[PDB]
Design a protein around this ligand. Structure first.
Ligand SMILES: CC(C)C[C@H](N)C(=O)NS(=O)(=O)OC[C@H]1OC[C@@H](CCCn2cc(CN)nn2)[C@H](O)[C@@H]1O
Ligand SMILES: [Mg+2]
Ligand SMILES: [Zn+2]
Length: 844
């Protein structure tokens, strides 16, 4: 055994020992209990970043821990290969997106294997291969004939200079983010998942997830946005029916979730596309411009509530069906056409958004709810204005005194008796649009025939192979400029027909890949029925918070779709969900000659502790703020150079010890040094132990007769084993478990283990400490364990807790004052010469 810890020699050898033993290549074996630990598969973007290392080390600690406890552990790995980054690099470096992708995969695979992750590489998938996306094209055709997938005209943003579609997040003040040209709203036919048909199922099944973060379940409930309200119809006054047709000339219909406050409606609001808005804007140019500004907007829903609410009066009036008040109709920019009826009622006294709107335009406010004896200020909003559980109605005629639920049913009675309203349930959830005007994506298995219509590709002709021999230029999606691809024959009549040139949303690949890992080479379906029954569902899911809404909801939607098709037997894909925090770093720059800043990568800097300067230039730079690692402010720390400088075990240990997994991790140069020096200490601790006698049989059994010092070390040992096991399986806080093993080595250093019984307790401490640290630093623990014990580490198993070593030794004693029944005198005074051991006597 070498005296000094050199990871470059022990990490490759330990990896071959694991690959030769094939301990990570697991099977559907009904002998050992299964465990499915899954980390979110990455985009093959070129190199791994620190966010990748943290996410996949967390998954590996959980996997190696469950494996050491006797589980059949599947930790698969794959690549989310479809996406825009491949097209952008294709335009930049003049290469094919497929070629650019496959070289990033084979390089990032070498980085992952160097870190020593226990990954079953015989289950590796790649979403850009036809052997994978053929099955989401297959599920597309099935759900398309059922109507779950349907084709419908939709509105998108078209950049007339970059010649492509842009999402709302890529539009800035009406212009494209790159071209800077005004975008055009276009109505094009697209495809949709009918996810609204599963809204009640996706909402209620969140209650089954007793091991999900409560905030993730909360965010999904708000996104679905179920609401039980009331449809209300306000009759249009006779002086306002000009230019209206159909039922719009008879009434204005709205939806509200608080019909108990219908007596407090001071005005109504309609969307810019509403017929009442169109009839009012016929001769007033101020309304025409307001409608045009609303249509030209591109507010993303992540910022929809943060936009300034604006409105214009129409001069038209409707009648409240309960008190007969004439309410003026306004055109509001926050009312979205297609969300319900496209028209709402406003109660400024009990809705904060209506309060700020009325305060802006000096609109009336009518209090109709009261909570206790609280004062109602018409010029200041209070939190109790919108309370529902502890309020009673006021200023509502024959509705005064009713609470929320009784007034709700009372209002429904009057509305239904008049035929002016009825209860209705609504959902904020929209359908899922999957059409993408991109090249590097899964083709949509639709063929357009002038006689048969939109025809799905039959199952025999799947997949519709995307040609990998394309280099996009940037002047339109290449699939539309390639007749050799879209010119085809109709699979129904054989006539001339064209293929769909739009590709699928890349979220479709990530929505079911966790099932494909169970049988990645299965060629007769999405997932083999035998492997789906064995693995069931993912036991542990690890990923970032940015996928808590869209990706997680899509994965649950696909799981219920595949369940209703007969492929799987679970309602939910993920049992446990761990949300890893981001990784941040310090930013550096220099001042530009034009009044700006040019950012510098931290690796190209060196600090004096005081100021900082370049590594080779000696030009003093300026240190800036700390934020998430990104190429924006050029603060990304390459983990490969970290592996080159310290090895894989130091990188894994630093990220597991710097902060808890949910908390953000700040990069620290001195932090990775403390991780490396601790691994040097652990190596020296085992070396110096074997240097004075060698290995012995670790202590086991009855500990009676051991010294007080050695008994205290065994107590600390089995306390650490119980503390680490609870930190891995339950708390999932890996930084606290590292310090627990560190404190065990502290007491070991302070304990004389030179005796014959001392050597045995020392062996028991070290054999457990290397197994307690194996999930975090498997390379050095594998090497050190083979020096202490000759058995295979994974067959020795997770350290067992000896509960006898935790029980303290008691000394029963009798206490008689004056004959009748230093620490013993203290307890016998909490009840004077004492005979040592059995008698204490209180000199009365
Ligand atoms: C299931 C799919 C939708 C996953 C998708 N292919 C994806 O997000 N792929 S990815 O390659 O983008 O991320 C792979 C995984 O591991 C890294 C995590 C951290 C990302 C944020 N971050 C970055 C830093 C410092 N550079 N600190 N935090 C990430 O959330 C994810 O869990
Ligand atoms: Mg349960
Ligand atoms: Zn046809």
């Amino acid at each position: 055994m070498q005296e000094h810890y050199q990871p470059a020699a022990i990490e490759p050898a330990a990896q071959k020992k694991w690959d030769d033993a094939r301990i990570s290549n697991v099977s559907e074996d009904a002998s050992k209990p299964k465990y499915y630990c899954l980390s979110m598969f990455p985009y093959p973007s070129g190199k791994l970043h620190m966010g990748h290392v943290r996410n996949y080390t967390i998954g590996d600690v959980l996997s190696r821990f469950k494996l050491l406890n006797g589980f059949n552990v599947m930790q698969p790995m794959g690549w989310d290969a479809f996406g825009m980054p491949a097209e952008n690099a294709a335009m930049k470096n003049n290469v094919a997106p497929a070629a650019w992708t496959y070289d990033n995969i084979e390089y990032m695979k070498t980085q992952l294997k160097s870190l020593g992750f226990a990954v079953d590489w015989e289950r590796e998938v790649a979403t850009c291969k036809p052997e994978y996306y053929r099955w989401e094209q297959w599920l597309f055709t099935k759900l398309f004939e059922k109507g779950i997938v349907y084709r419908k005209n939709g509105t998108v943003n078209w950049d007339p200079v970059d010649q492509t579609v842009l999402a709302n997040e890529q539009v800035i003040d009406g212009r494209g983010w790159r071209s800077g040209a005004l975008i055009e709203k276009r109505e094009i036919p697209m495809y949709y998942f009918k996810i609204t048909d599963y809204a009640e199922e996706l909402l209620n099944d969140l209650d089954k997830l007793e091991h999900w973060p409560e905030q993730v379940k909360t965010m999904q409930r708000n996104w679905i946005g179920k609401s039980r309200g009331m449809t209300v119809r306000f009759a249009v006054s006779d002086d306002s029916k000009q230019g209206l047709e159909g039922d719009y000339a008879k009434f204005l219909q709205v939806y509200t979730t608080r019909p108990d406050t219908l007596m407090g409606a001071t005005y109504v609001a309609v969307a810019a596309e509403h017929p009442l808005a169109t009839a009012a804007a016929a001769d007033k140019p101020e309304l025409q411009a307001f409608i045009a500004e609303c249509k030209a907007g591109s507010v993303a829903e992540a910022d929809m509530a943060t936009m300034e609410k604006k409105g214009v009066p129409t001069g038209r009036y409707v009648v409240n069906p309960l008190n007969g008040d004439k309410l003026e109709v306004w055109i509001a920019n926050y009312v979205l056409w297609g969300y319900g009826d496209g028209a709402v009622m406003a109660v400024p006294a009990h809705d904060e958004r209506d309060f700020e709107f009325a305060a802006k335009y000096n609109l009336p406010k009518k209090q109709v709810i009261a909570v206790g004896d609280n004062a109602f200020d018409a010029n200041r909003w209070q939190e109790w204005y919108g309370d529902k559980e502890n309020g009673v109605l006021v200023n509502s005629g024959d509705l005064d005194g009713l609470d929320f639920q009784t007034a709700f049913d009372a209002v429904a009675a009057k509305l239904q008796s008049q035929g002016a309203g009825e209860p209705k349930t609504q959902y904020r959830l929209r359908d899922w649009g999957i059409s993408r005007q991109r090249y590097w994506g899964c083709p949509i298995p639709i063929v357009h025939c002038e006689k048969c219509g939109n025809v799905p590709v039959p199952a025999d002709q799947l997949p519709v192979v995307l040609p990998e021999n394309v280099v996009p230029d940037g002047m339109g999606s290449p699939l539309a400029k390639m007749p050799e691809f879209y010119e085809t024959s109709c699979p129904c009549c054989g006539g001339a027909a064209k293929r769909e040139t739009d590709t699928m949303d890349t979220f479709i690949e990530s929505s079911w890949y966790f099932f494909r890992y169970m049988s990645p080479k299965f060629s007769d379906g999405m997932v083999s029925a035998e492997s789906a029954k064995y693995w069931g569902a993912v036991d542990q899911y690890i990923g970032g918070i940015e996928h808590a809404i869209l990706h997680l909801l899509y994965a649950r939607f696909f799981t219920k779709l595949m369940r209703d098709e007969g492929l799987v037997n679970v309602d939910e894909p993920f049992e446990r969900l761990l949300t890893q925090g981001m990784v941040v770093c310090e930013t550096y720059y220099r001042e530009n000659d034009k009044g700006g800043k040019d950012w510098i990568n931290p690796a190209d800097v060196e600090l004096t502790p005081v100021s900082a300067v370049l590594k080779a230039d000696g030009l003093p730079v300026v240190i800036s703020g700390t934020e998430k690692m990104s190429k924006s402010k050029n603060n990304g720390v390459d983990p490969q150079e970290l592996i080159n400088a310290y090895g894989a075990d130091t990188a894994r240990l630093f990220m597991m010890f710097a902060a808890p997994p949910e908390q953000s991790l700040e990069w620290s140069d001195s932090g990775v040094e403390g991780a490396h020096r601790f691994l040097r200490r652990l190596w020296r601790t085992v070396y110096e132990y074997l240097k004075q006698g060698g290995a012995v049989k670790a202590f086991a059994g009855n500990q009676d007769g051991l010294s007080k010092e050695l008994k205290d070390l065994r107590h600390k040992l089995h306390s650490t084993t119980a503390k680490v096991s609870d930190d891995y399986g339950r708390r999932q806080q890996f930084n606290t478990a590292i310090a627990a093993v560190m404190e065990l080595l502290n007491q070991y250093d302070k304990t004389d283990t030179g005796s014959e019984q001392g050597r045995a307790v020392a062996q028991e401490v070290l054999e457990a400490a290397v197994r307690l640290l194996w999930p975090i630093v498997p390379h050095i623990c594998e090497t050190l364990w083979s020096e202490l014990n000759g058995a295979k580490l994974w067959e020795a198993g997770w350290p067992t807790v000896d509960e006898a070593a935790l029980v303290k030794s008691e000394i029963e004693v009798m206490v008689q004052v004056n004959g009748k029944l230093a620490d013993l005198e203290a307890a016998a005074l909490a009840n004077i010469i004492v005979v040592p051991g059995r008698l204490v006597n209180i000199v009365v």
